């Protein structure tokens, strides 16, 4: 019934029904007129022939490392380089935020309610002839056909980059903190209504349980000592709710902070290695602020692990990642004399794309051992046997799936995978290519251009007919990867602006909060300008084990 | 013990102890240097002998109505004049928030907690030697003393820029849907997690209230009939809570939304007047959207109210309580180029200069009859008996006291008054002084210089003895008036960046939802921007009876 179910607001101009069968679109700033925002004006005419591809620029990035290794070292040059790719994506997102799982329109609900993700293009109207709202058929593929076909693993494909588990535990452990759902409520809801790097997973989403979780002494976390090793408090010293099956020795049910993060010891390896951290810099701080009281110290560790996340994550994790060869800098300095909105909201469609479940092994093997996920999942032992050292150790060693390839989920995630097509289904999401053009994409002609080969896009012609239903989740698993890179073009253009907008966007990156003092002195602020994956490491593991976020 | 208690840090710069007795300053971006952020960079003395002062410029502003009432014509200049106001305040204001009732420094909690309202300058060390620092003694002027010394009324004052009661009234009712102190949890903290213009006051603070209060028809706000006049729905009708007397009739008991309007025949009149316009909209929506379903015609409606809200506050109530002769305006897309944050944070120094009580008469006159506050408080019939109409007039003609004059608070509200004195000295509060280079203004040198005369001076310095001991609410409430002017130039200087922040900051101001379509089409976006505290009246009081904020 409703008139903008045919999506016909081109170049992101509004569109409202105007009368029932009658509709009428807002390209208020787009950048087009006409009925549905597609005319340019000069001006869009003028950058338009200019725009190079994200592909005819990946290239750049990717190549010339001569001409990188002369950039990369003139400061001046940069930060230059760096604030443009700050600044570039950022156009892409809301702020503040608009759409929701429940209205497609504005409202004050949707941009009041922190309970809902929020969403870069709004649902599909629930009274749409089809699924994507005009095109297809009444129904969608077969979810379990679609997942078997073209997204389970058959011979597991290694990421061409070289990912380490190291990466992919701790991209699973980090997002963590924002990818909440709130399953009670339903897909669209979120936990998280930090909607941001709080370090929540690690302190607790409430106060009353960074309360159940804090020292109180020295302003440190509360902590156990298991063969002279520091590991998280029993879920029955502090009294912290965790998920643990009842099968779980008391010893064994490890506080931490994020209620999920004890059901994978690649998780609470990492948040062993943080409740370290925390208690380290607060250390650094009692003897730099000896008159200080617990709650500064606190506080102020807190506020510095925020930093250290942040700056590891940009420096580490995205530069790798992304195969750049230019340098990626974590400057909040960068954007003060640009406009940028302090603020951040996660929507659901960052929550989507990131169901890196390929990136997972098919088995978990720490060196001398090889664990079946029924064994890995939520076990006290394979951590506490073979300890943080002989872990990280065990994993730098480790190569990850690939995402962008094609059949590459692992059976045992399987269902996981389905879900995530059928969830997004549930809240009415929008077709793959309403995603790309969403994202500054030209929409796909073919299932084969998607994936860039045959055996898959011939399958998935079988099942969507037209390209223009594919869906966006699986389509991000299938597409042809970037040369010899884990993602596709999807994976990389939607996300990216997500990601650097909620690292950005983080208030102590705001220019009042951006200053030693802020942390506690030079000191704690050095702290957050010198850290990496490594150091991360060093400090808080046995030996000081070399790590990367690459197989080496 | 603190070391920064003696608040050494100058032109903004931080400070924290480095050993408890030692501390340091953080002038970064001050724009000084030196141990206390004092000697200038050269830039700064530049901009310095250059910076023209709040007074004169207030007199440009008020003065030369020739030169203004030609700028007031060149739609070029006047945009031009206004972007300036607009922006130049908005440096006073730290977004996102900084430091609130308990933390002196940053934190996260600080500034994750919506609960609490922000502070424009740190509590005091709670180990202080004494209540402002170091400066004055152990103990505070007896606020009693100082209530009646220099703030209780004798005769009263009349405003000398006309406010009527139009103006008193609406500023109560706006306000207080921002201001709503949470007094279960103590000063500091707020009810009001909108931090803003939300109409909250209107349609509830919570999804259970707007749903209490709602129709579900038509996007309409629920309501009742008593002899042919629309007023509130009944507290028994919709469920929701209010706050009356026992001996209060069921149908004395107005609904409306915030839980304390019920209270004062001002305020109720208010919310039959918006809860009115809800509705109005809402019809002026159906039939521009047939097809809208309810839910719809509500948010929408909602936001076109704050828009309404927003548009008046600026170019009526602002305009009026300013004086000036430019003519001030809502424009959204005049910060568009310029750098500003989409968000906003109530600050305790916001909610306490707002305590205008002074403007408040002895007798609540309504054309033919003449109230003790004893019997306006909580009264069902008085607004049942004159109507909307015979109230609207009777208090365009009627007279407000005067803020910033001396001795003006009604003894009835002396109660509330103290409290205010009483209540910023719990949240630790600053000095008049400190408050008032920390918004660029000098410090006052002698009671005589603050008051302008000498007889109440005198009296403050038996109290006080140090002008830097002088306290912020008082100093509002007594200071020299600006010429025929209602207001000291602290009340001026603090509160306008303050209040053009949550204004300009509300979300609806955005460059993504300040458009056409964010509110149903043009019709509902010309509601927004033809919206005047007349055409409020006109359209929703019976017989359009003149108004003005002025007392003509
Ligand atoms: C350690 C093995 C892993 C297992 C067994 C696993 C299992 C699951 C399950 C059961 C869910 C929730 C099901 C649902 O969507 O309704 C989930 C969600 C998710 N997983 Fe994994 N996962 C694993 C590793 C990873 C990794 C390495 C990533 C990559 C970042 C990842 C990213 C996500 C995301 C983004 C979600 C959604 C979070 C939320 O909405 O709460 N997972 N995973
Ligand atoms: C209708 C007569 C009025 C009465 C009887 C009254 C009464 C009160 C009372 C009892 C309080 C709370 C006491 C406290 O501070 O702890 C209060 C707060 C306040 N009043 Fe009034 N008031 C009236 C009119 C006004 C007017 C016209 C203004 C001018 C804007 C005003 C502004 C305020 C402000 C800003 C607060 C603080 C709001 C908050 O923190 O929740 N009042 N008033
Ligand atoms: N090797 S690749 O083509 O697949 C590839 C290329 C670029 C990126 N990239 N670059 C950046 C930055 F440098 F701008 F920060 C951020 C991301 C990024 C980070 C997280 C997500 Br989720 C999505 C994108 C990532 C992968
Ligand atoms: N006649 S006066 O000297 O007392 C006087 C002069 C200027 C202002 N003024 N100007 C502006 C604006 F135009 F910039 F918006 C806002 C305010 C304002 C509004 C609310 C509060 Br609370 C405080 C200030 C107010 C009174
Ligand atoms: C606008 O789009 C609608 C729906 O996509 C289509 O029916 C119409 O022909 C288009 N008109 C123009 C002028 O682009
Ligand atoms: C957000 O919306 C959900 C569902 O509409 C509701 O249950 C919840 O109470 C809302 N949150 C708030 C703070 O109103
Ligand atoms: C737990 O880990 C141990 C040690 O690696 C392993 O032998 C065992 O299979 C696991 N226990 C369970 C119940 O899976
Ligand atoms: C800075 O202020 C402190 C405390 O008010 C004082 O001891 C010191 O002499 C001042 N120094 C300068 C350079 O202003
Ligand atoms: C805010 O802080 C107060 C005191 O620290 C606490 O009692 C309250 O629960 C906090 N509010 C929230 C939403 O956490
Ligand atoms: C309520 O208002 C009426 C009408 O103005 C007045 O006569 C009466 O005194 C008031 N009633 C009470 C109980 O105060």
């Given at each position: 019934?409703?008139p903008?179910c045919?999506?016909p607001?081109?170049?992101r101009?509004?569109?409202?029904?105007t009368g029932?069968?009658?509709?009428?679109?807002?390209?208020?700033?787009?950048g087009?007129?006409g009925?549905?925002?597609?005319?340019?004006?000069?001006?869009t005419?003028?950058?338009?022939?200019?725009?190079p591809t994200?592909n005819?620029?990946?290239?750049?990035?990717?190549?010339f490392?001569g001409?990188?290794?002369?950039?990369?070292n003139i400061?001046?040059?940069?930060?230059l380089?760096?604030?443009?790719?700050?600044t570039?994506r950022?156009y892409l997102?809301?702020?503040p935020?608009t759409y929701?799982?429940?209205?497609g329109?504005?409202?004050?609900?949707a941009?009041?309610?922190?309970?809902y993700?929020?969403?870069?293009l709004?649902?599909?109207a629930?009274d749409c002839?089809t699924?994507?709202?005009?095109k297809?058929?009444?129904?969608?593929?077969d979810?379990?056909?679609?997942?078997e076909?073209?997204?389970?693993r058959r011979?597991?494909?290694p990421?061409?980059?070289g990912?380490?588990?190291?990466?992919?535990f701790?991209?699973?452990?980090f997002?963590h903190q924002?990818?909440?759902t709130?399953?009670?409520?339903?897909?669209?809801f979120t936990?998280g209504?930090?909607?941001g790097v709080?370090?929540?997973?690690?302190?607790?989403?409430?106060?009353?349980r960074?309360?159940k979780?804090?020292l109180?002494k020295?302003?440190?976390?509360?902590?156990?000592?298991?063969?002279?090793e520091?590991y998280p408090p029993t879920?029955k010293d502090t009294?912290?709710?965790?998920?643990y099956?009842?099968?779980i020795?008391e010893?064994?049910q490890?506080?931490?902070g994020?209620?999920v993060?004890?059901?994978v010891?690649g998780?609470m390896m990492?948040a062993?290695?943080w409740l370290?951290?925390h208690?380290?810099?607060?250390?650094?701080?009692?003897?730099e602020?000896?008159?200080?009281?617990?709650?500064?110290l606190?506080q102020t560790?807190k506020?510095?692990?925020i930093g250290?996340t942040?700056?590891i994550?940009?420096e580490?994790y995205?530069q790798?990642?992304?195969?750049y060869?230019?340098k990626?800098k974590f400057?909040?300095?960068?954007?003060?004399?640009?406009?940028?909105q302090?603020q951040?909201?996660i929507?659901?469609?960052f929550n989507?794309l990131?169901?890196?479940?390929?990136?997972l092994?098919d088995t978990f093997?720490?060196?001398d051992?090889?664990?079946?996920?029924?064994?890995?999942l939520?076990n006290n032992s394979?951590?506490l046997?073979?300890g943080?050292?002989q872990?990280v150790?065990?994993?730098t060693?480790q190569?990850?799936?690939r995402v962008?390839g094609?059949?590459?989920?692992?059976?045992?995630?399987?269902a996981?995978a389905?879900?995530?097509?059928?969830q997004?289904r549930e809240?009415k999401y929008?077709s793959?290519?309403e995603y790309?053009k969403?994202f500054?994409?030209?929409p796909?002609?073919s299932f084969?251009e998607?994936?860039?080969?045959?055996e898959?896009?011939?399958?998935?012609?079988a099942?969507?007919?037209?390209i223009?239903?594919?869906e966006?989740?699986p389509?991000?698993?299938?597409?042809?990867?970037?040369?010899?890179?884990?993602?596709?073009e999807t994976m990389?253009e939607?996300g990216?602006?997500?990601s650097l907008?909620?690292?950005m966007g983080n208030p102590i990156?705001?220019?009042?909060?951006?200053?030693?003092?802020?942390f506690?002195?030079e000191?704690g602020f050095?702290?957050?300008?010198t850290?990496?994956?490594?150091?991360l490491?060093?400090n808080?593991v046995?030996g000081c084990?070399f790590?990367?976020?690459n197989?080496?």
């Amino acid at each position: 019934a409703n008139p903008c179910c045919s999506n016909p607001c081109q170049n992101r101009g509004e569109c409202m029904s105007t009368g029932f069968d009658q509709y009428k679109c807002d390209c208020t700033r787009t950048g087009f007129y006409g009925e549905n925002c597609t005319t340019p004006e000069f001006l869009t005419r003028i950058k338009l022939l200019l725009k190079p591809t994200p592909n005819t620029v990946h290239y750049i990035l990717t190549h010339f490392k001569g001409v990188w290794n002369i950039v990369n070292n003139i400061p001046f040059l940069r930060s230059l380089i760096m604030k443009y790719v700050l600044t570039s994506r950022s156009y892409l997102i809301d702020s503040p935020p608009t759409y929701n799982v429940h209205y497609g329109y504005k409202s004050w609900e949707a941009f009041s309610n922190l309970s809902y993700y929020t969403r870069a293009l709004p649902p599909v109207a629930d009274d749409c002839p089809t699924p994507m709202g005009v095109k297809g058929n009444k129904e969608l593929p077969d979810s379990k056909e679609v997942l078997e076909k073209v997204l389970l693993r058959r011979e597991f494909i290694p990421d061409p980059q070289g990912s380490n588990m190291m990466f992919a535990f701790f991209a699973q452990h980090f997002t963590h903190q924002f990818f909440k759902t709130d399953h009670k409520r339903g897909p669209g809801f979120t936990r998280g209504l930090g909607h941001g790097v709080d370090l929540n997973h690690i302190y607790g989403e409430t106060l009353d349980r960074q309360h159940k979780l804090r020292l109180f002494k020295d302003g440190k976390l509360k902590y156990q000592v298991i063969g002279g090793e520091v590991y998280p408090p029993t879920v029955k010293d502090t009294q912290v709710e965790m998920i643990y099956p009842p099968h779980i020795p008391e010893n064994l049910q490890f506080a931490v902070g994020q209620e999920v993060f004890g059901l994978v010891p690649g998780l609470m390896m990492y948040a062993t290695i943080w409740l370290r951290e925390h208690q380290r810099v607060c250390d650094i701080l009692k003897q730099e602020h000896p008159e200080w009281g617990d709650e500064q110290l606190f506080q102020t560790s807190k506020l510095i692990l925020i930093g250290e996340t942040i700056k590891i994550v940009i420096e580490d994790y995205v530069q790798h990642l992304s195969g750049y060869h230019f340098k990626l800098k974590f400057d909040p300095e960068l954007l003060f004399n640009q406009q940028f909105q302090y603020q951040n909201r996660i929507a659901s469609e960052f929550n989507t794309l990131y169901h890196w479940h390929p990136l997972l092994p098919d088995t978990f093997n720490i060196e001398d051992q090889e664990y079946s996920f029924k064994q890995f999942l939520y076990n006290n032992s394979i951590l506490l046997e073979h300890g943080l050292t002989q872990f990280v150790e065990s994993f730098t060693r480790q190569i990850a799936g690939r995402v962008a390839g094609g059949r590459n989920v692992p059976i045992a995630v399987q269902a996981v995978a389905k879900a995530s097509i059928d969830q997004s289904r549930e809240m009415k999401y929008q077709s793959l290519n309403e995603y790309r053009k969403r994202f500054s994409l030209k929409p796909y002609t073919s299932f084969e251009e998607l994936t860039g080969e045959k055996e898959m896009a011939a399958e998935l012609k079988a099942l969507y007919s037209d390209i223009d239903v594919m869906e966006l989740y699986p389509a991000l698993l299938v597409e042809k990867p970037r040369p010899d890179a884990i993602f596709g073009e999807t994976m990389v253009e939607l996300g990216a602006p997500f990601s650097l907008k909620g690292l950005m966007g983080n208030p102590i990156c705001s220019p009042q909060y951006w200053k030693p003092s802020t942390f506690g002195g030079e000191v704690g602020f050095k702290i957050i300008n010198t850290a990496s994956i490594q150091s991360l490491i060093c400090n808080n593991v046995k030996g000081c084990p070399f790590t990367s976020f690459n197989v080496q």
